[PDB]
Design a protein around this motif. Sequence first.
Motif, PDB file in Angstrom:
ATOM      1  N   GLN A  60      -9.255 -17.814 -22.336  1.00 22.77           N
ATOM      2  CA  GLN A  60      -8.519 -16.652 -22.841  1.00 22.77           C
ATOM      3  C   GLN A  60      -7.645 -16.980 -24.078  1.00 22.77           C
ATOM      4  N   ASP A 453     -10.810  -6.239 -16.959  1.00 26.50           N
ATOM      5  CA  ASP A 453     -11.119  -7.524 -17.588  1.00 26.50           C
ATOM      6  C   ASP A 453     -11.597  -7.344 -19.030  1.00 26.50           C
ATOM      7  N   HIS A 456      -8.444  -6.870 -21.177  1.00 25.64           N
ATOM      8  CA  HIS A 456      -7.569  -8.038 -21.288  1.00 25.64           C
ATOM      9  C   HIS A 456      -8.196  -9.087 -22.170  1.00 25.64           C
ATOM     10  N   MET A 459      -7.925  -8.125 -25.732  1.00 18.44           N
ATOM     11  CA  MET A 459      -6.611  -7.538 -25.953  1.00 18.44           C
ATOM     12  C   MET A 459      -6.110  -7.661 -27.402  1.00 18.44           C
ATOM     13  N   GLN A 629      -3.376  -2.522 -18.175  1.00 21.63           N
ATOM     14  CA  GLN A 629      -3.933  -3.209 -19.333  1.00 21.63           C
ATOM     15  C   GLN A 629      -4.120  -2.244 -20.529  1.00 21.63           C
ATOM     16  N   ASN A 633      -2.293  -2.728 -23.916  1.00 22.12           N
ATOM     17  CA  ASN A 633      -3.072  -2.760 -25.152  1.00 22.12           C
ATOM     18  C   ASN A 633      -2.578  -1.755 -26.201  1.00 22.12           C
ATOM     19  N   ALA A 688       0.241  -7.759 -20.798  1.00 23.87           N
ATOM     20  CA  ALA A 688      -0.478  -8.647 -21.699  1.00 23.87           C
ATOM     21  C   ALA A 688      -0.394 -10.126 -21.312  1.00 23.87           C
ATOM     22  N   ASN A 692      -5.603 -12.854 -16.935  1.00 24.22           N
ATOM     23  CA  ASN A 692      -6.697 -11.877 -16.871  1.00 24.22           C
ATOM     24  C   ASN A 692      -6.262 -10.456 -16.517  1.00 24.22           C
ATOM     25  N   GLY A 693      -4.989 -10.164 -16.733  1.00 22.72           N
ATOM     26  CA  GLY A 693      -4.448  -8.855 -16.425  1.00 22.72           C
ATOM     27  C   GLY A 693      -4.287  -8.576 -14.937  1.00 22.72           C
TER      28      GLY A 693
END
Length: 712
Positions: A60, A453, A456, A459, A629, A633, A688, A692-693
Amino acid sequence: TDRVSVGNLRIARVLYDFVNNEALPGTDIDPDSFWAGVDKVVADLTPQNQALLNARDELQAQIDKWHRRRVIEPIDMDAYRQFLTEIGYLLPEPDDFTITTSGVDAEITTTAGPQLVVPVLNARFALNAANARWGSLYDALYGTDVIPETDGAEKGPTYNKVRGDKVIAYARKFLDDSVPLSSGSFGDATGFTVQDGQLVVALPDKSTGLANPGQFAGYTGAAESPTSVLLINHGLHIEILIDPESQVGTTDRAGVKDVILESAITTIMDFEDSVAAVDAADKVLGYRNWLGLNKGDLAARVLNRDRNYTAPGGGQFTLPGRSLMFVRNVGHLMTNDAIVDTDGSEVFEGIMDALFTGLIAIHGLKASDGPLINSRTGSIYIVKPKMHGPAEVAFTCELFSRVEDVLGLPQNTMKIGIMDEERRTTVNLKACIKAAADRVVFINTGFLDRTGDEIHTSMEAGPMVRKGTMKSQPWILAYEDHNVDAGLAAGFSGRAQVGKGMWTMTELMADMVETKIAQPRAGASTAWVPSPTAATLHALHYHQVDVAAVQQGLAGKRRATIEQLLTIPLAKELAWAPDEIREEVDNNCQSILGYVVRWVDQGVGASKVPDIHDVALMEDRATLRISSQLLANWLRHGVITSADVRASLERMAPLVDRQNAVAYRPMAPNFDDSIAFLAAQELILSGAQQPNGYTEPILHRRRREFKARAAE
Ligand SMILES: O=C(O)[C@H]1CS[C@@H](c2ccncc2)N1
Ligand SMILES: [Mg+2]
């Protein structure tokens, strides 16, 4: 403290006693040996568990950076793909192969039909689900909007005969479509009889048999005046109950009382996203219901017996009266204080779930009180959520293998349901299936978690499309077809379930009946339904669609590309008016608040929650993941400000308060005094930065805070 020392482990006494007194007896596992195994398994597998979670964070971090060093413009797929490959996110695809999974029940290998998911912490929902294998069509039709509530046919205090006649007519048409007579319509039948082992349907002017005599499964009562007739179509049973002296039979031309459909063939007892379980006391409540189900002695109402019938020719047989049970364990992320080590470190929950739900499942493999309750072929079926890629699947398989040893079970007894609900699994799916080629009994897709997912992961790329838009984006449509393709290419047809997602709109059954048919048409052997009533209605779809034939037709097709899977759902230039932005904010804030308030305050992880338009939704925790998420975002990319988020939260909270009009305590107007309101706010503002949120770390903390306040 209140703990039991076993090697490096300090087990909560409530858990220790539960396992010793309730779960171990009857399994012939040595109690000391089992606990030694628990300590041994936790010690051996904890470091790899942690290694995998750090690799998620590392991938990530690299993708966040890839985006941040790039300016506007169209993506450029070849570089992006190349990059995902270099960092080990995208792995090479292995050669074609066939899964070899064995000892699996017919309900999974061959039968296509609805699948129920229910919180294991709710003893009454679990029991109703287990018993939902056979459901009343007349009840499901009378009781929902499938028969429109228009003039004259509205649902009142007592039986409405105009409505009941439309019910009858609907069911007659279903019979004509599913089990055709050689001549005439079921709508005109006057009686049913069995002569020479053949079903004879009496019409006003003549008699007739089935166009396909093979669809006659059997009957109850006298051949010359049966109490019920049993039919079969696409592997699913249909029972016509005959009783002229019933409320409904008395109004019917053949004295038909009801049509019973084999409905929820399988059911998933959930320890994950539909339940709120944040400490040892909660986990024991769950483990205890899982135990009662498997012993067949859970009572909140009891569990059904098998159903007796007479074969066409005159002999006897029986059919399963209960849904075949899976359990969904929690995934790789969370720890739980049910067990801590000597340093005070919480143990990984997924590892514990494997050990304890697997121990408990042994009871469903033996006589209840009383043929055995669950798997006659000797399997334990575990659905494993939130895995990221083939190394994580490989780890779960190694975990199951070590648990099997401890429990004295033969290798591969513990079967896996692989949820394809993370991007890194999606783009490596064939490899994920291969990692579990001797254990896999299903794969499935969904909307809420996988979309979380998606948001994220990308993002940093830019502002995403609205939540409602996500459902029709190119990435997700490719995701769905790619999942089916992978399964079929791995030989799932006739061996394992290929499943699709939940219908969440609990009261919109007419809409469900109209649109959920797309799922079996797309070759899904099963899909998720939110209630026994919905299971019965969704069973209709499997009568209209020959899933087996559908799958055989999709054989060898490649209908989605890696490019398509990787198409990030970025919003285009100036996509929204100010009012559409506000609506989306309000929508997401309400979905978070509505869910979080019952979760944090009452430990409820699933229920019929009204949305902002007061449509009843039954979603699990994943609804939190996507909404938070999306908001995060939009905040990240300047679509909305933090004052916008605040104002929406402030607007939606009293509306949620009203929708809960009980032990409910209003969030408004003293927001900072409400732990659940503060939880909602945190999920968004910290969205954020959550791995992985995932919402669990925040949710579990806040619920434990609420519990602690409640003990003063
Ligand atoms: O695993 C998932 O992604 C979710 C999406 S809806 C959810 C569910 C909804 C209602 N009751 C139980 C479970 N399953
Ligand atoms: Mg999920």
